[PDB]
Design an enzyme around this catalytic site. Structure first.
Site, mmCIF file in Angstrom:
data_model
loop_
_atom_site.group_PDB
_atom_site.id
_atom_site.type_symbol
_atom_site.label_atom_id
_atom_site.label_comp_id
_atom_site.label_asym_id
_atom_site.label_seq_id
_atom_site.Cartn_x
_atom_site.Cartn_y
_atom_site.Cartn_z
ATOM 1 N N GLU A 1 0.886 -1.192 0.000
ATOM 2 C CA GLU A 1 0.000 0.000 0.000
ATOM 3 C C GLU A 1 0.911 1.224 0.000
ATOM 4 O O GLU A 1 1.924 1.258 0.735
ATOM 5 C CB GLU A 1 -0.814 0.193 1.298
ATOM 6 C CG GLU A 1 -1.689 -0.915 1.833
ATOM 7 C CD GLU A 1 -2.023 -0.715 3.328
ATOM 8 O OE1 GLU A 1 -1.664 -1.586 4.206
ATOM 9 O OE2 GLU A 1 -2.634 0.339 3.619
ATOM 10 N N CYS B 1 -2.419 7.257 7.032
ATOM 11 C CA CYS B 1 -1.743 6.904 5.736
ATOM 12 C C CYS B 1 -2.060 7.945 4.684
ATOM 13 O O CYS B 1 -1.256 8.208 3.766
ATOM 14 C CB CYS B 1 -2.113 5.519 5.209
ATOM 15 S SG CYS B 1 -1.544 4.270 6.340
#
Lengths: 541, 541
Positions: B292, B326
């Protein structure tokens, strides 16, 4: 519009027709064979729906088993042809992606039914002629497997769409399976008309547009496949067929920043791609490389093997389609006592097996696909004659004067058969190692240690402990595993997955996982009464 | 043995505790905070089950918001430490893979229950202290999200195992989900204790063994996570913790031919890996790279937005965890009429928002994670002051003398806010562009054209057509999409998938698709009465 939650038709595997004497399909097949053989055609690019010969080199497509007989002529795609194919794909994208799933699905369901009915013998015959398949090999491939890919892919896609999340109190979560951005490049091999039609159509189903570069020797069936898809209502430019050797097409496709993915199947020398990891900062999206490799398979027969089962599995497994399926049985490990019972009959049946012009339906098979393949097989046969460790037990003869014919060949190897020899060609060459009955477990160890390129393996044994010991010890030595049958091509929905040892190809054609590679899923969350103060409970005095 | 088809416990999302004054969890949390802060510890490697400090450089782990206060000290892994971690992983493999699924699952279910009960405040406190999270940010991460990953991963894996094929007449087809060959290298970021525990444990669940290199600033919680897993019965060497900056670990792991995969989450500058495409012919298996990226998110408010909803979504979205999730909201596009109604209150609430020592639970948040992050935020704030197009509307102050503190900052941008500025840091900096109400559609176009690094986007609007127009026009401009709430981290099972535009990360943590990356599925076909003659019906006279 439409207010509904629709269901797709339920798929079942398409029945295989036998083409037995006096059967009506046999009569229809003869007509299509005459018709394609006697009226060769231009094999044009299909770009934006326009069928056109390009300015590249003219290349004839012939019958491998009668290579004087032309089937058609194509033109080697130029850089301009390829750039046009890309533009057409990009221009079709917006109207195609905007079609509801059900309308996209209908195209492929309709193609399936057209292939099952009125196009059936035509597409089969084309596959027989250009790829030198017997009618049975054509039927399980160009008809049943392609029909199955379309019907099952539609059902798989529909199953994907209804995989949805949990909504908690106060909210509604949903998942949208978006198509990719940019075009998909599909590159397809000679060996299967089904794989060739599937690689471009699977991403197309999920809303993508595509450029498709089929293999030269399969281009007759590929062109007819494109015509079939048009007849099913595939809109212009959703898939764009570019013929030839592929080099100018890859130069254009791999340099285009809009390349969203590559769907490819062929060697693992073309799996090497490097060229995409180079250009990574040129692409709008990270390209998705979705590939299958070939390999060479093994069969081990325990002392409890049924001899006529083993013998048949070896003959079909090694010699079906002249050993040119994506993998074929190249190595057998047979218990001494079983070899005593069926070794002579294996050799005699292999010697009698008829390869010839596949318009003569009495033949078992045809010729090798082209001159390059013929030479690789000549070279392997000549290596085997020269090699100390190996005796030619039957076959070994070859003659390229009328077609690319290589006889079924059985090699006897005194020491366990070494995998590296067996991988340099695809052809009808079976290597047999006879091992003492009591060394079964040791032979399983040898197979395990010396097999990196097996897609499939089989154990022939009636003894349940022998079976389980093979399933356990060879668990990682092959990808798909067979008990008491030839290890071979999967039927769609029945033998998914596998791959060679170490491969990463769970996403290959044949399950929903392939179709998910052609989507980019997003979650949508709506909150009905969101917070109106930012402070958290822990913050209180 | 066991004669059963067992079912796993059904997962539900773990409740989030509030830690409100007078609550018992608040009392327990204080005790754990004192206990970790007042008794710093060695933070050793854990290799083959042995906890040991290595010979590398000593590196202190401190409280970001009070960087004089040490929490522990680790040693930078050397090449020898890393090689030992690899050997231990390989040595544990055979006994771990041979454990039935249910016994592997039990370890993680037991860990989940340990984390939910007796380890709950300890692991939360450790995450507060080392990563500078408020108690709420610690609770949704280090407790609920990690618990959820474990329980849901067990249920996902069980669902995978029962995906089986169709058996036709005369046969039985089955699918075996094999673990990979070789070890998995997991590299985890500072931002989330949940991601840090999940990346190594997800492949471990499916029968693999692992080396785990956590981020330095998260290593206190990572060490305690390892202890928790041991207490749950994780066998020695299944996961091997190597501390430090990661460089010597990657030199060893990436050169080892047994590297089967990499599970990684952090920047897309470390996504660049190249180093694996170089060495491809050295590896026994094709390594699986499962990653990711981070990104920066946007919110668009239509004229129909509820102002207190928008304001709260901006404050939480931008300033929760100091903008270090994130992704975080970096850009807001707000209709003029809505800005008139809530712009002053947004600025005033941002000015009052308290960042400080997170052992004072009245604070909203803490400090930035380390000095490098502080400097990047200083640099972005100073760019904004110097830039013609941008005014600092509130905040902008910073002071690294006691902790790495940056105040919540709101920038006003006269021209639509340019994404490239916003990506150079993670921090509490929100850029607001006020646009005329009637230009909603044009602003959607600007967002679409100028957003390549948004993981998430939100639309704030009560008007259903405005909602649908955002869902349509921004369909490809973000990965997960929110309506009338802050766009933020998913809850497990509720907001899977997404990624930045163009990414290929459908296989990230949070669905069954991640667990399938840690398996190699094979089909097993048994045929009950296989053919005993090789001849086909079409061949008859």
């Amino acid at each position: 519009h439409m207010d509904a939650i629709t269901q797709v038709p339920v798929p079942a595997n398409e029945p295989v027709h036998d083409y037995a004497p006096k059967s009506p399909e046999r009569t229809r097949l003869r007509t299509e064979l005459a018709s394609l053989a006697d009226h060769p055609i231009d094999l044009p690019h299909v770009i934006g729906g326009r069928h056109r010969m390009g300015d590249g080199e003219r290349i004839d497509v012939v019958q491998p088993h009668r290579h004087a007989a032309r089937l058609g002529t194509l033109t080697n795609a130029t850089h301009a042809d390829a750039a046009a194919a890309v533009e057409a794909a990009m221009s079709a994208k917006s109207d195609w992606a905007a079609l509801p799933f059900d309308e996209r699905a209908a195209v492929f369901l309709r193609a399936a039914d057209l292939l099952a009915g009125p196009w059936r013998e035509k597409i089969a015959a084309a596959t027989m002629l250009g790829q030198s398949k017997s009618v049975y090999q054509a039927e399980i491939d160009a008809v049943c497997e392609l029909i199955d890919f379309w019907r099952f892919n539609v059902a798989f896609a529909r199953q994907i769409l209804e995989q949805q999340p949990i909504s908690g109190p106060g909210e509604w979560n949903r998942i949208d399976y978006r198509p990719l951005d940019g075009f998909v490049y599909a590159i397809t091999p000679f060996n299967f008309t089904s794989i060739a039609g599937n690689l471009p159509t699977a991403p197309a189903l999920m809303g993508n547009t595509v450029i498709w570069k089929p293999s030269i020797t399969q281009t007759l069936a590929a062109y007819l496949t494109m015509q079939l898809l048009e007849a099913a209502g595939l809109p212009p430019g959703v898939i764009n067929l570019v013929t030839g050797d592929g080099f100018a097409v890859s130069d254009v496709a791999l340099a285009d920043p809009r390349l969203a993915g590559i769907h490819f199947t062929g060697s693992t020398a073309t799996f090497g791609w490097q060229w995409v990891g180079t250009n990574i900062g040129r692409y709008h999206s990270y390209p998705r490389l979705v590939g299958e490799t070939g390999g060479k398979d093994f069969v081990v027969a325990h002392a409890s093997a049924r001899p006529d089962v083993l013998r048949t599995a070896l003959i079909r497994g090694a010699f079906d389609y002249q050993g040119q399926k994506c993998s074929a049985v190249s190595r057998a490990f047979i218990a001494h006592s079983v070899w005593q019972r069926m070794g002579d009959e294996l050799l005699a049946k292999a010697a009698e097996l008829r390869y010839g012009d596949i318009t003569d339906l009495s033949n078992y098979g045809g010729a090798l696909i082209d001159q390059r393949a013929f030479v690789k097989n000549v070279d392997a046969i000549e290596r085997a004659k020269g090699a100390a460790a190996v005796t030619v037990a039957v076959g070994g003869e070859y003659d390229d004067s009328e077609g690319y014919f290589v006889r079924p060949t059985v090699l006897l190897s005194d020491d366990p058969t070494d995998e590296s020899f067996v991988i340099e060609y695809f052809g009808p060459l079976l290597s047999v190692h006879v091992y003492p009955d009591e060394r079964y477990e040791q032979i399983l160890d040898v197979i395990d240690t010396g097999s990196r390129y097996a897609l499939t393996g089989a154990v022939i044994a009636d003894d349940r402990q022998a079976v389980l010991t093979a399933l356990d010890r060879l668990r990682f030595a092959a990808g798909n595993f067979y008990v008491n049958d030839k290890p071979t091509g999967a039927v769609v929905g029945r033998q998914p997955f596998g791959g060679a040892r170490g491969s990463d190809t769970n996403d290959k054609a044949g399950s929903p996982l392939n179709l998910l590679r052609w989507t980019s899923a997003r979650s949508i969350k709506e909150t009905f009464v969101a917070a109106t103060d930012h402070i958290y409970p822990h913050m209180a005095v």
